[model samples]
Target: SHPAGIILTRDSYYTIPSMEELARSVDENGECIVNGFTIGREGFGSIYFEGIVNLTNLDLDSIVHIRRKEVIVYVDDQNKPPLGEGLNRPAQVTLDEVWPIDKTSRCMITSPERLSEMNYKSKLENASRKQGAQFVDYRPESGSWVFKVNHF
Candidate 1:
């Protein structure tokens, strides 16, 4: 089959890493990236996965269902901007058990079934309050609703 996946660089160049290797690699911006991704606390960092790259050395082409995997991202002690390093550090990683989605400045909600405009607006407001965010506005999109919220 094809090589597992691709590694993307800050300068927008993409290439393949030694998939079989279990260590680190460098990007165009000289960030220490890794392969053989771990699944625990300390394993959190700036990881770039272009496609399913066999995280945890698992077999390829297996039938897998998906769930909402909580992604943890935050400013580190150095307090470097998330977009620091000139687009190299696209996702600055620190740690979080809380859903990172809670930190979003905007959120879009979509359901297969349609709801009235009032219903949609209330839903957005309720979600914003429940999640400690502020509701700005909501508009219809295709068959869904897009809304903006701010927590900070």
Candidate 2:
């Protein structure tokens, strides 16, 4: 036996909910929107919640592979920003689905292989487009394709 008390796995299921429905439900219920889940010392951290879509239909393997894309550190009120690192970013084309895992979890993954297809260059372009932003290519010095957005 592995140990005196060890539970192998927890039974779970994934479900897909409509974006509009989720938005309306949140608006009416005043519930926190969860972006994803992360595992760490204190435990899992919740990611983007505001205006986020819900994901369902994920399998066990997928749930076990989810990961957070970025890290965020809080500063003072004047310097603090409302947005969290990697929030509301574009979903990799390879991802089967994306959503907030819950408070106990940061993010859930439906497929690990999908990550390789998510290059920084591609992600930058997609993020810019999704947010109606713009980017300037600076690949030479950066040694990698880069995108920058400026507001006038």
Question: Which candidate comes out best when scored by TM-score?
Answer: 1
Summarize candidate 2's per-residue lDDT along 95-134 as a digit string, tens digits.
Answer: 2122223346565422334333344345655775786645
Give each model a TM-score. 0.25, 0.19
lDDT of 1 by residue, 1-152 (tens): 43333332223211234333423443445443453232222222122332223333222122111112223323243422233221123221222221212126544334423445236557655875686544444443332222222200
Cα RMSD to native, each candidate? 13.9, 18.5
Worst 10 residues of 2 by lDDT: 39-48
lDDT of each: 0.31, 0.30
lDDT of 1: 0.31
